[PDB]
């Protein structure tokens, strides 16, 4: 296994950790704030996923400072992970095209 496929795997594992920790911390941050909906773990996890994927339906979102800071970490982890996968795919294709051209 080369570097790019290693970093991609690591980013995927790390993303899973961020989703789980993010769901836990979001509930912890949002409870205590009147009107907050991000307050139970199952839907918090669903919120984490759609935050990391950038979909953001808007059915759930943080209203507190720390809940929003947690969200930012989830967003960045998502953008970085999927960005790291795209870069890895590009490296794979560049290398294969390099061999195909006999260089």
């Amino acid at each position, epitope marked *: 296994s080369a570097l790019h496929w290693r970093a991609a795997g690591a980013a995927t594992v790390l993303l899973v950790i961020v989703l789980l920790a993010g769901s836990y911390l979001a*509930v*912890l941050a949002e409870r*205590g*704030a*009147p*009107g907050a*909906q991000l*307050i139970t*773990y199952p839907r918090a996890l669903w919120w984490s996923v759609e935050t990391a994927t950038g979909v953001g339906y808007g059915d759930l979102y943080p209203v507190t400072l720390w809940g929003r800071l947690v969200a930012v970490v989830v967003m960045v982890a998502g953008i970085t992970s999927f960005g790291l996968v795209t870069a890895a795919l590009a490296t794979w294709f560049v290398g294969r095209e390099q061999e195909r051209r006999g260089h």
Partner: antibody, heavy 118, light 106 residues
Framework: QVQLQQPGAELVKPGASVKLSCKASGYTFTSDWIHWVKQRPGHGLEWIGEIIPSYGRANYNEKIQKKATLTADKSSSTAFMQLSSLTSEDSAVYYC???????????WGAGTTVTVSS | DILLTQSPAILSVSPGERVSFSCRASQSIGTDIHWYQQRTNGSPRLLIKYASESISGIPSRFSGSGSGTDFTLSINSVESEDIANYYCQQSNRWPFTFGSGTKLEI
């Protein structure tokens, strides 16, 4: 086995303070919240506050005067509620309940009847 | 905060007859409502979670329905042990709140 164990009763003098206990058993998770509910005779259920033992953070009902302070001990799996400066208005049954972080109170304690009197 | 209205406060029914308790939320809360039973001198007891999901140990004659703002707890053929107070509770928005409760009479 009884998941939540509370003392039967507590007698408190007007102005004094009392710490109610709630010893938990059964399955315990990091996502567990312990809630406290106040019920006056003839009246309904009134939410007081919550605490997450795995982190120690507590939240309280903003609609009522804060006379409670929630703490927890992970070593003995026991939740505590510190009621301070009590009047006859504070005389009620105080239940503790366990929520698995999914919104509902799966199990309740037997309740601690608190009487404020001289 | 979310207000839960339970009306009527008292429901009189004949034995074996179907009864329905109503719970109305001050705003839309999907299906995040839960039902509890409290008999005389007893502690509350979970009957239905998430509006309609049954609980292990609870008689099949207990059921729930509704979504949004209007929720209903139903009892098929009320018997004597069903005499109690019935409370609804929401978990959609912080803080959790309880309804005022409905008493069942036979």
């Amino acid at each position: 086995q009884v998941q939540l164990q509370q003392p039967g009763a507590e007698l408190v003098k007007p102005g004094a303070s009392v710490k109610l206990s709630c010893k938990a058993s059964g399955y315990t998770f990091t996502s567990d919240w312990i809630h406290w509910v106040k019920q006056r005779p003839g009246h309904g259920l009134e939410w007081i506050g919550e605490i997450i033992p795995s982190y120690g953070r507590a939240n309280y009902n903003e609609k009522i005067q804060k006379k409670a302070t929630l703490t927890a001990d992970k070593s003995s799996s026991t939740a505590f509620m510190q009621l301070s400066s009590l009047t006859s208005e504070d005389s009620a049954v105080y239940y503790c309940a366990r929520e698995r972080g999914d919104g509902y109170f799966a199990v309740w304690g037997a309740g601690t009847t608190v009487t404020v009197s001289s | 905060d979310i207000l839960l209205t339970q009306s009527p406060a008292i429901l009189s029914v004949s034995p074996g007859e179907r009864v329905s308790f109503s719970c109305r939320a001050s705003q839309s809360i999907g299906t995040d409502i839960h039902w509890y039973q409290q008999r005389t001198n007893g502690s509350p007891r979970l009957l239905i979670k998430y509006a309609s999901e049954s609980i292990s140990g609870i008689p099949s004659r207990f059921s729930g329905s509704g979504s949004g703002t209007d929720f209903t707890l139903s009892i098929n053929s009320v018997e004597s042990e069903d005499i109690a107070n019935y409370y609804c509770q929401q978990s959609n928005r912080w803080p959790f709140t309880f309804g005022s409760g409905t008493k069942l009479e036979i």
